[PDB]
Design a protein around this ligand. Structure first.
Ligand SMILES: O=S(=O)(O)c1cccc2cccc(Nc3ccccc3)c12
Length: 134
């Protein structure tokens, strides 16, 4: 067993709050905001050794990242940002920082009851996206 044991599995998006405002703060354009905001992605989390993989499948785009905690990697996000990402485990919460164009956003993923709660933060604007097991 390992730390991420309660994160592993397939998760389906069940609610979203403030995601359009979060996307605006990130700089996402109108058309991408409309189409991306409609999507109801799944999140598939798996662990193999020290490598964590998070896949997101949706009608908008399919993305996948694999990474080792604390080790920076390149990520092309669903909205086509080329970012430098570092993901760590802080007190049981996966903390994902993305840097690009002098900007920064943080995505936190944590277990709460039977939910996986994803909090996306950009300059004082937060979006909460709640997932439950598929
Ligand atoms: O990757 S997320 O961190 O959510 C994300 C973060 C910030 C901006 C985003 C803009 C468009 C789509 C996303 N993802 C997305 C992917 C599939 C379906 C719907 C939205 C964005």
């Amino acid at each position: 067993g390992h730390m991420c044991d309660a994160f592993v599995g397939t998760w389906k998006l069940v609610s979203s709050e403030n995601f359009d405002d979060y996307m605006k703060e990130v700089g996402v354009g109108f058309a991408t905001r409309k189409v991306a905001g409609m999507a109801k992605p799944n999140m598939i989390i798996s662990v193999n050794g020290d490598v964590i993989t998070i896949k997101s499948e949706s009608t908008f785009k399919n993305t996948e990242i694999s990474f080792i905690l604390g080790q920076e990697f390149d990520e092309v996000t669903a909205d086509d940002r080329k970012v430098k990402s570092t993901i760590t485990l802080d007190g049981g919460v996966l903390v994902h920082v993305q840097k690009w164009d002098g900007k920064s956003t943080t995505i936190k993923r944590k277990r709460e009851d039977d939910k996986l709660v994803v909090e996306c933060v950009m300059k004082g604007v937060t979006s909460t996206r709640v997932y439950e097991r598929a």
